[PDB]
Design a protein around this ligand. Sequence first.
Ligand SMILES: Nc1ncnc2c1ncn2[C@@H]1O[C@H](COP(=O)(O)OP(=O)(O)OP(=O)(O)O)[C@@H](O)[C@H]1O
Ligand SMILES: Nc1ncnc2c1ncn2[C@@H]1O[C@H](COP(=O)(O)OP(=O)(O)OP(=O)(O)O)[C@@H](O)[C@H]1O
Ligand SMILES: C#Cc1cccc(COC(=O)NCCCC[C@H](N)C(=O)O)c1
Ligand SMILES: C#Cc1cccc(COC(=O)NCCCC[C@H](N)C(=O)O)c1
Ligand SMILES: [K+]
Ligand SMILES: [K+]
Ligand SMILES: [K+]
Ligand SMILES: [K+]
Ligand SMILES: [Mg+2]
Ligand SMILES: [Mg+2]
Ligand SMILES: [Mg+2]
Ligand SMILES: [Mg+2]
Ligand SMILES: [Mg+2]
Ligand SMILES: [Mg+2]
Lengths: 261, 261
Amino acid sequence: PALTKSQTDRLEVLLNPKDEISLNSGKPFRELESELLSRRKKDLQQIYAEERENYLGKLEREITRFFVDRGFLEIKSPILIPLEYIERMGLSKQIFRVDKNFCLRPMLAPNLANYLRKLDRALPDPIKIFEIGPCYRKESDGKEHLEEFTMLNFCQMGSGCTRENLESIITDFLNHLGIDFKIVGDSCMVFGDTLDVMHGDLELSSAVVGPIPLDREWGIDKPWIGAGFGLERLLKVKHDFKNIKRAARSGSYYNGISTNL
Amino acid sequence: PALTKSQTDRLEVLLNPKDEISLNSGKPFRELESELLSRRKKDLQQIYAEERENYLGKLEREITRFFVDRGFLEIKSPILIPLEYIERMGLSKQIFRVDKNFCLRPMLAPNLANYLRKLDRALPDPIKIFEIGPCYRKESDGKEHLEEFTMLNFCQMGSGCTRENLESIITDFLNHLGIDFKIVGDSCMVFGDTLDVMHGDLELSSAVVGPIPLDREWGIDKPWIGAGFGLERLLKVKHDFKNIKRAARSGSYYNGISTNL
Ligand SMILES: Nc1ncnc2c1ncn2[C@@H]1O[C@H](COP(=O)(O)OP(=O)(O)OP(=O)(O)O)[C@@H](O)[C@H]1O
Ligand SMILES: Nc1ncnc2c1ncn2[C@@H]1O[C@H](COP(=O)(O)OP(=O)(O)OP(=O)(O)O)[C@@H](O)[C@H]1O
Ligand SMILES: C#Cc1cccc(COC(=O)NCCCC[C@H](N)C(=O)O)c1
Ligand SMILES: C#Cc1cccc(COC(=O)NCCCC[C@H](N)C(=O)O)c1
Ligand SMILES: [K+]
Ligand SMILES: [K+]
Ligand SMILES: [K+]
Ligand SMILES: [K+]
Ligand SMILES: [Mg+2]
Ligand SMILES: [Mg+2]
Ligand SMILES: [Mg+2]
Ligand SMILES: [Mg+2]
Ligand SMILES: [Mg+2]
Ligand SMILES: [Mg+2]
């Protein structure tokens, strides 16, 4: 007997990377579904009994410890921001607008630029800060983009803002998480030349060595470096998820396990 | 010499609860401002050198540990939700709308209700879950309301869902944070009868003992208890802030210290 598309989709929802189950092995849908429901119930029961931590929250906490311990100040800035923060940043069709003059932030950079400028009046060189939190863009497009995702951005301004120090921070960070990567040359319209941090064909991060001409519009007038990483992409690599939706804030998956059981 | 309103406001921005400084003591504005700028720079320098943790993030982590250790599953659910989640919940003019069919969640309850229903199919009784994260309402109105604030909601469904267990969890929680409180009877249009958790005239939490008639609309069909707390109000009490804006996500204050230095 052959599986319908609806049946295959249901089994794919219930399958996890650790399974070694063939959906097209001739076993009827009913037995594959019952087997996978039992395994996923067991998996959630184990999480509930023994760990109880959300993957996104736990990764945020692990990242926070890494950067606080290396001298970076932890920032929590608004998610709902002025629409004016563009074209002050220079996408475009991807912005979720809110009322008339606001939007959901698509990136952390504008608030962090404001903090770098302000903190440089008070703190010793170099200024090192980071933020982790939700960002929003109109794009889902399958297995690597979410509309609601979680960004880490760290940055430094003053001394030590060289390409080699930027690459060394990225290397120490991804070594800490156990993720292999390479660095490639890329570009974008906001920052210009970028380094891209790649895991295979998956972009984990865009990183920048300043100064860039945009600095003047933000009152930034010292060398700087910084990088942005999406946490759901990190989780996708760490847990070998086929689709990034497994990693997202959602009511449909808990730690990559279907909640429809 | 007398201070203008603009001068008093500037000094109030720079004053912190720990100061014992009189703004109307006859000293000129210039010397009060210079003294307070020096103290606040020192304060930020100390944070940068020795702790580097954001107050909201650190409190989120402390709360997360408290509830995970007591058997509650940590949830991270979407912040951008369907507008349909009302009037399915039953405010009203306070919702930030996004595009046509979405809004910024004003509360955590609908996503947590969905998780309780789903998890009860997989997990043993009782089901215990919680979430911490941003919520949004159109109201600032001074010293106790923010438009972007951070909610803790914990809840339990099944056995043990009594008023006395709810009060005991609240008591253990606020004792852990070192915050005195009392419980009063209140009501609201969404849940009906509520307990209010009060610190003086400041509402820290609204809590509910189910079942309530709204349960049927969410597929909830067991006893339940739950409570919501605003983290910025907890921080306001803990740090004796005069205005809740000191506690909020912001680019204008870092851990209650003005960033305009
Ligand atoms: N829609 C999205 N969903 C999930 N993660 C994202 C999304 N957009 C960006 N990220 C993450 O944020 C990082 C920095 O993002 P940037 O601001 O450079 O976006 P990006 O270059 O458009 O990413 P991509 O080229 O894959 O669309 C990316 O490398 C990725 O890890
Ligand atoms: N605008 C806000 N700013 C900051 N915290 C809030 C806000 N609204 C609610 N909270 C917090 O969330 C808790 C639960 O909120 P609920 O959903 O009961 O709101 P609420 O009863 O309108 O609060 P209040 O009566 O003070 O307006 C409150 O007890 C408070 O701690
Ligand atoms: C404008 C501006 C600005 C000026 C100076 C300093 C900062 C600090 O902020 C940063 O760290 N920027 C780097 C983020 C890189 C990823 C980014 N989302 C991208 O689209 O490629 C910002
Ligand atoms: C509908 C529904 C629903 C049904 C069953 C269970 C839950 C679980 O969610 C909860 O814990 N609710 C309690 C929150 C109390 C504070 C609240 N913001 C207020 O406006 O007073 C929700
Ligand atoms: K598999
Ligand atoms: K999401
Ligand atoms: K004071
Ligand atoms: K805010
Ligand atoms: Mg993109
Ligand atoms: Mg790209
Ligand atoms: Mg990029
Ligand atoms: Mg209210
Ligand atoms: Mg109230
Ligand atoms: Mg209330």
